[PDB]
Design a protein around this ligand. Structure first.
Ligand SMILES: CCCCCCCCCCCCCCCCC[C@@H](O)O[C@H](CO[C@H](O)CCCCCCCCCCCCCCC)COP(=O)(O)OCC[N+](C)(C)C
Lengths: 175, 70
């Protein structure tokens, strides 16, 4: 459906087999789903048509809010409360967006597991690799801040991590 | 409807928080400066505060005193 982007939430082309009745005996599934169609799907469809025309009579729009970029906690003086406030709000918004990204990837993984059925272990390596990469990055960003987290604590954690990385690289170079 | 009739936009609370933070930070730095100024004035006594009285020199009598050597 157009209600969501197909690229963000991909699906395989959905190949389905064709009915191959090898016997002439009538299968009750076909007749029963036809009577279901007649007794259920049409009245629901007509009610939806009524509701959709009534909605089309009154059309109005809502907008997705755009947020400007502001200097982050690194370009903030040690006691300048206003810039720290701006940077903290921006960092919290980014944290929420990252959580939503991880949610999207997890939804992809769950859909793959259910869809591929008995061969999910092989036919879901792509989603597993994507989730592993995203999970590793998210953990590196936000794993251990705890309650009372902030942009300053995240910056300190990043500085410690990249100091360790610089030390390791220097040790490798001077090996 | 609820948002229109009961609440306001994020700008109001955002900028009110900005103003509140600015006031509170100024008050904090003022308190610290005031404590340091009090410490300095009480230590040296060269300020307007902690001025303890000394004898007024207008009480001294500057006249011959029945004896040349005071
Ligand atoms: C399905 C549709 C209905 C949905 C349900 C809605 C019901 C809402 C009831 C609960 C309301 C919760 C509180 C909401 C009001 C908060 C206080 C204040 O903000 O509201 C003021 C309005 O409050 C109302 O004037 C008073 C509400 C009182 C509700 C009482 C309901 C029960 C009364 C029962 C009496 C029955 C008769 C007596 C029988 C004996 C206007 O706010 P304002 O300061 O502008 O906000 C600034 C931002 N602006 C400018 C954009 C608005």
């Amino acid at each position: 459906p157009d209600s969501w982007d197909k690229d963000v939430y991909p699906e395989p082309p959905r190949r389905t087999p064709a009915p191959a009745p090898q016997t002439s005996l009538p299968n009750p599934v076909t007749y029963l789903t036809k009577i279901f169609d007649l007794l259920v799907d049409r009245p629901v469809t007509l009610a939806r048509e009524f509701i959709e025309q009534q909605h089309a009579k009154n059309r109005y729009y809502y907008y997705h809010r755009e947020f400007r970029r502001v200097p982050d906690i690194t370009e903030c003086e040690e006691k300048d409360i206003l810039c720290m406030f701006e940077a903290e709000m921006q960092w919290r918004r980014d944290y929420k967006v990252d959580q939503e990204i991880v949610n999207i990837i997890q939804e992809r993984l769950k859909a793959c597991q259910q869809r591929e059925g008995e061969s999910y272990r092989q036919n879901c390596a792509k989603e597993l690799e994507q989730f592993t990469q995203v999970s590793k990055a998210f953990q590196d960003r936000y794993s251990d801040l705890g309650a009372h987290y902030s942009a300053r604590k995240c910056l300190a954690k990043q500085k410690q991590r990249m100091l360790a990385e610089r030390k390791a690289a220097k040790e490798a170079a001077a090996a | 409807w609820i948002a229109r009739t009961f609440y306001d936009g994020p700008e109001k609370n955002y900028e009110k928080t900005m103003a509140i933070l600015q006031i509170e930070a100024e008050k904090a730095e003022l308190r610290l400066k005031e404590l340091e100024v009090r410490r300095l004035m009480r230590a040296r006594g060269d300020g307007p505060w902690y001025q303890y009285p000394t004898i007024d020199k207008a009480l001294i009598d500057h006249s011959p005193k029945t004896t040349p050597d005071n």
